[PDB]
Design a protein around this ligand. Sequence first.
Ligand SMILES: Nc1ncnc2c1ncn2[C@H]1C[C@H](O)[C@@H](COP(=O)(O)OP(=O)(O)OP(=O)(O)O)O1
Ligand SMILES: Nc1ncnc2c1ncn2[C@H]1C[C@H](O)[C@@H](COP(=O)(O)OP(=O)(O)OP(=O)(O)O)O1
Ligand SMILES: Nc1ncnc2c1ncn2[C@H]1C[C@H](O)[C@@H](COP(=O)(O)OP(=O)(O)OP(=O)(O)O)O1
Ligand SMILES: [Mg+2]
Ligand SMILES: [Mg+2]
Ligand SMILES: [Mg+2]
Lengths: 35, 174, 139, 139, 91, 91, 91, 91, 96, 96, 96, 138
Amino acid sequence: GITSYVRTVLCEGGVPQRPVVFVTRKKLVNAIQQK
Amino acid sequence: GITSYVRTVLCEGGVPQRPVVFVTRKKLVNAIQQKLSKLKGEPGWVTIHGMAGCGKSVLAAEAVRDHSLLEGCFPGGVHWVSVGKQDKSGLLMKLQNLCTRLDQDESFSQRLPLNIEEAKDRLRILMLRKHPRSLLILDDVWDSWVLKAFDSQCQILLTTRDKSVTDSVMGPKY
Amino acid sequence: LSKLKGEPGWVTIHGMAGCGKSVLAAEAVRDHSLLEGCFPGGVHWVSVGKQDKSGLLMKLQNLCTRLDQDESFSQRLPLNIEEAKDRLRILMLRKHPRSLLILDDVWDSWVLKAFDSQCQILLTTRDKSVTDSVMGPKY
Amino acid sequence: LSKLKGEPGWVTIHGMAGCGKSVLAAEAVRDHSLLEGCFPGGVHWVSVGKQDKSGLLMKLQNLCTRLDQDESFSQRLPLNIEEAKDRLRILMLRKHPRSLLILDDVWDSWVLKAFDSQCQILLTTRDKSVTDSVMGPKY
Amino acid sequence: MDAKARNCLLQHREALEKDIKTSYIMDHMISDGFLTISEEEKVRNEPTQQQRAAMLIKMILKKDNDSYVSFYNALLHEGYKDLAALLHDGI
Amino acid sequence: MDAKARNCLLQHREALEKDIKTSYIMDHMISDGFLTISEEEKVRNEPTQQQRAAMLIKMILKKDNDSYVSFYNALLHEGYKDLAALLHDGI
Amino acid sequence: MDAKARNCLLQHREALEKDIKTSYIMDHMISDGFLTISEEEKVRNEPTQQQRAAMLIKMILKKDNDSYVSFYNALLHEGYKDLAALLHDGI
Amino acid sequence: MDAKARNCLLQHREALEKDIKTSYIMDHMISDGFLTISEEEKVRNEPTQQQRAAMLIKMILKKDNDSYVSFYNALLHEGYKDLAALLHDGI
Amino acid sequence: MDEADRRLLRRCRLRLVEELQVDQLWDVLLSRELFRPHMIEDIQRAGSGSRRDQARQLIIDLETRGSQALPLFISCLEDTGQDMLASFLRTNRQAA
Amino acid sequence: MDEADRRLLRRCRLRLVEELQVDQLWDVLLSRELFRPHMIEDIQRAGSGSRRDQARQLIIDLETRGSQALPLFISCLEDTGQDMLASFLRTNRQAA
Amino acid sequence: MDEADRRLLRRCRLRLVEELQVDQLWDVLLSRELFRPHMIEDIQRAGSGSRRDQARQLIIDLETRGSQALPLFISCLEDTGQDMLASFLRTNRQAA
Amino acid sequence: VVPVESSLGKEKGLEILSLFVNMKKADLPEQAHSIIKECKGSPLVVSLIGALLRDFPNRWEYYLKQLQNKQFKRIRKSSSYDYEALDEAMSISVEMLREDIKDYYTDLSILQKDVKVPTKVLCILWDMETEEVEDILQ
Ligand SMILES: Nc1ncnc2c1ncn2[C@H]1C[C@H](O)[C@@H](COP(=O)(O)OP(=O)(O)OP(=O)(O)O)O1
Ligand SMILES: Nc1ncnc2c1ncn2[C@H]1C[C@H](O)[C@@H](COP(=O)(O)OP(=O)(O)OP(=O)(O)O)O1
Ligand SMILES: Nc1ncnc2c1ncn2[C@H]1C[C@H](O)[C@@H](COP(=O)(O)OP(=O)(O)OP(=O)(O)O)O1
Ligand SMILES: [Mg+2]
Ligand SMILES: [Mg+2]
Ligand SMILES: [Mg+2]
């Protein structure tokens, strides 16, 4: 669940928005994020 | 029934006024507008296409011509860019020109970028803060790198002949 | 001339050479009634003449310098015709809201394409073919 | 050195090579008493060396940049020696009223001609002929 | 900050600059922790109140969403009701 | 002014600034002809008396010998005996 | 403004700056519509009245003939009779 | 001063400024040796008591822990019980 | 003291400085600890020491006496017999 | 605040700074919420704090108080009894 | 005036201004040349001109009256009969 | 370093394939299961096949046999990603290696799809001493 605010920071950052056809990799994302 | 105000926003935008001899296409205009309404927020691209001379531009001009969809939906003004067909050098100028157009205040550096990406930054930033609720309309467009250039993460709708063109781009496309 | 009370619009005036075409243009605006009530914006006259692409470019910059008396807008001048078109449209839109532009002669369409600011401009000439590229009500 | 309490003036110091000529200049000013009461203006040292006309020019600009710490004066630098002379004289006159300038070496007269600001400058050297072009009391 | 927020500011930054007095507003934003002392002096150092307002607004535009609400509350609390009204749209 | 005069001022300008009140002293000076109304307002306009004293002293330092004596007499006449004593050295 | 007007101002701008108080004069010129609020704050913001007067005069010099008369009437109305007298020459 | 101290001040500096009268409090802090005469005049020179309070508090914030207690004792001793209560948290 | 009470004392400035009787209040302000003995004398010596000047200084200092300053002030008014003034103030704070 | 009212306050600068009585206005400006307590203090401390300096700062700050600043100002003038000044201002705004 | 005396007068500010009787001091401050006639009037006109405000301005100005300012001040206190105040100050400076 | 092996999940790719063609996962044709085996979890291949299918839902088996062919020249899509095809990506990686190294990789070509060969055999083909051979591989 993206916060509205998150998108606002992200837009400023300029990271691409995720492709509409995607599938989370919870374990991997979690690992990078925790690390 | 055009509001007086609608014309005032439209003049700033620079969209051409509809030809005096025109005939509404209510169903089509309605469809684009309702769809156009759909990306209420967050980036998004709309492609419109037909064999040559199908009323493709006029509809784009006409769709935004109305107050209801535009006024409630689009606090940001509308900006129209006539892309045409371009070699890499030619494309560069349009970007600077859009830079000059958008920054009426001139607070941003008078110097203009010599690099396409830098212009992309000026657009994104300008769309983000100066005018984000803004919608950008394009005319023609014949190759992908072009939209790659305009791919500001802010809604831009391109109207054209090829429908292949918006394949490089990312985000919801209708 | 009164007719396009608002919203863009072009007026063409024409005759075989030396028919009083300019003087009428000067004379029409010479009067207070039509001009004062109708035209809160000032009147700007441009002498277009006949021009190669390069020559045309200068007139635009010169109109830029003329219109922006304050100089608030960038001292730098556009090297591109369209950018000048933007400076004109924007200047007409905000700086001079009710302004009327008059042109002298004009011999080819791209020229009016250049001046096609969506703000009323009236061109006075010899060819009546000239205002065919343009869009909006024409009389 | 105390003697020219006010009004322009030049002091020359000389010896065969390596006689302690600079160190004395540095040493003389090293003391508080003569400097503090006498010299409300700061002391500026310039290392002139030996110079072709072009080389000399740069030292002047550099002294210009050094003296004008505020930068109130034009950021642009003079391309002409005399103009630099003006910037020095004016700066010495207003910006640093009681200042003393010390020079190192110096091998030809036009050089002091350049520095001849009418404000006290003392040159320390090998030739004593050098300060002959200059005007004002010399010791 | 949000697109609509930043834009709402830009849309009315002129009417704001032509009326608002920065000191009281900066007292609030400083207390709220959305304005720094240095930022405050840069604004105060401006020759005219229109430039001070302009500088404040110039700063707030590059700030987070909470600063937009801090500025909005300050305006209300300080009597700039109509201008706070115009910004109600922004967040 | 004299080297010893200017120096004596500098040597004690801090103790002076920390104690003297400028108005009475400027009344005396403004009458001696060593101070101008404009100079007087620049000094008076200072936010704190330490800065006023500092400004006065700043001005006197670029003045003639007679101004040093005018300032010294003013101090005595105004009760700043100890500070006038410290300046006795200067001329 | 007229040559004689602009020059009469310049010829006496020093005596003016050394005596006139700007606030009352600006009240008049503001009422007459020959001075703006911004212009008024730039003048008021000056550190000393000589600079305020100097700024006002600096501004009036680039103004129309009516402003010369507005400034002249203000001076009279405000008691600067002798200075208004000196400017009588100018228009 | 301590983080909790400085923050307790900031957390209630508004309620304080809206109530407290600086003179009596400065008499105490001067006596305690936690406020100087110059500092005292800067505070006193403020146009309104809200700004005087604001200036005092502005100053105390950059002071040591003992000044926080001096200000707290002064408030109590001066009848500002509820405001002293709010600051009890801070040290 | 909250903004409502501070604003109330401001809006009511005239009625207060026109009506306040301070002669018999002194001891009640002290007895209820609304003000400290030193402040009480500051108030009595305010301006020309006229009833009005005293009354004006009293209501200004009141803003600095905490959250119970107003209801405490009202209690002193009542034990002094200034019922209309106490009534007006009460009705206003109670109008919430 | 629209240009007509801003222009009116400018053209009328003299009459205003010459006639305004601020002593009894303070509480009405606060009571009607024309100005905020902090600004009111700023006005009272304007310049030398003279009636004129206060009056001048008041009318300058008035431009920043919104569309109802003038009619609200007029109401404060009236409840202060400054009828001629209120009358002049009213006749001017009503001359439309 | 040295730092020791500049701090002693500050630490005892309260006990001073909160105890100082200035009415009969004026002539002694003048008679002993501790202050100059114009400063004396500045002190008497300090703030509201209340005993406290006068007393506060007196002790602040004292810092600017030289090395003998304190012992001279103490002498004026004594010839005024303010023995406890003079005693306290003496014991403090003598505690060295 | 977090190291992302290119694998993916069979459950997930079916999830991805469904999104690509917009149907309840079960509703998906029998053909679909097998092509994912070819994909080997390179999500680039899945998106690449998936988009490729958006245009031609009918030619489902074709690409199945195509990947059974083992040539990736057939699969192409314009995409947000910066390459026409998966073959396209690998070519970019190969070039960088210093010329001396570059020849060696090709020898590396012979090795089975799924054999973990003991270092030695690489030593033998190379004819280069073991302490050295490991490092190039590193
Ligand atoms: N009501 C109308 N709707 C559509 N077209 C109209 C109408 N009235 C007249 N026309 C004619 C006149 C115009 O030349 C043309 C509209 O141009 P448009 O549809 O924008 O072509 P286009 O811009 O798609 O062509 P291209 O593909 O070359 O850009 O149709
Ligand atoms: N009252 C008048 N009305 C019209 N023309 C007049 C009048 N009085 C004198 N003239 C003559 C003198 C001028 O040279 C000429 C007016 O020029 P004008 O009608 O503007 O020609 P023109 O500008 O149309 O020519 P071109 O087509 O070459 O631009 O007519
Ligand atoms: N107390 C001293 N006084 C003078 N010279 C000293 C002393 N101590 C050491 N020296 C030596 C070390 C230095 O190299 C040298 C001082 O250089 P200096 O006298 O300035 O020569 P100079 O600068 O006159 O030479 P030139 O004529 O080449 O410029 O003498
Ligand atoms: Mg088209
Ligand atoms: Mg002609
Ligand atoms: Mg040497």
